[PDB]
């Protein structure tokens, strides 16, 4: 795992995805912090969202544990920062990297799945009143991610 994690860290220094950064918290190469900047034109714009990453000992055969530390208004992310996303569970691939996972999560922000939601109340508002969804997401971005 360690050599693969080192390789991913070097890739993030050299050529990170536009809105995404990640690196070890301190001495522990298996515990990272990440940031996603709020995508341009989304209600998350101007926001910085922190995540924790714990690599398992048999990474990359097993997925990293990824959760938001910053509160965010989204149907597939709860207030505890749990991300319900298939690539973090049964649809993980050892060819995915932290870089690709953070880019994948960033794309989930711009295009949520309200049909099979983690937070039904937020999904309901997303489907029925997009401008209300966007208003609340913008308020949460100002309140929690700035």
């Amino acid at each position: 795992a360690l050599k693969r994690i080192h390789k991913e860290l070097n890739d993030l220094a050299r050529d990170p995805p536009a809105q995404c950064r990640a690196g070890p918290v301190g001495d522990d190469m298996f515990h990272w912090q990440a940031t996603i900047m709020g995508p341009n034109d989304s209600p998350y714009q101007g926001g910085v969202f922190f995540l924790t990453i714990h690599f398992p000992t048999d990474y990359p055969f097993k997925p990293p544990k990824v959760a938001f530390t910053t509160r965010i208004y989204h149907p597939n992310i709860n207030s505890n920062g749990s991300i319900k996303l298939d690539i973090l569970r049964s649809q993980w691939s050892p060819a995915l990297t932290i870089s690709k996972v953070l880019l994948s999560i960033c794309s989930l922000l711009c295009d949520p799945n309200p049909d099979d939601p983690l937070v039904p109340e937020i999904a309901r508002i997303y489907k029925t009143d997009r401008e209300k969804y966007n208003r609340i997401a913008r308020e949460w971005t100002q309140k929690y991610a700035m």
Binding site: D11, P17, A18, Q19, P39, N40, S42, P75, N76, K84, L85, D86, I87, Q91, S93, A95, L96, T97, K100, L103, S104, C106, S107, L108, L109, C110, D111, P112, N113, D116, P117, L118
Partner: protein, 77 residues
């Protein structure tokens, strides 16, 4: 007309010859030809946005020497 780049899942970068009017569907068909990745397993990302199959490169302001980012088909729940 113009070249665009795709950073594939492994970080390998490939070059496509495209028209701004090309559908995302056609770009995925070209990726299948070069890489043997079925279109339904391709999620293309530009400026943090997933690229939808029935839209065009021009619809996302993808220009000469733009880089598309290929990740795996995903589903939030």
């Amino acid at each position: 007309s113009m070249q665009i780049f795709v950073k594939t899942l492994t970080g390998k970068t490939i070059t496509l010859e495209v028209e701004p009017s090309d559908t995302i569907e056609n770009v995925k068909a070209k990726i299948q030809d070069k890489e043997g990745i079925p279109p339904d397993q391709q999620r293309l990302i530009f400026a943090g946005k997933q690229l939808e199959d029935g839209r065009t490169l021009s619809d996302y302001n993808i220009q000469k020497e733009s880089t598309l980012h290929l990740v795996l088909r995903l589903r939030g729940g």
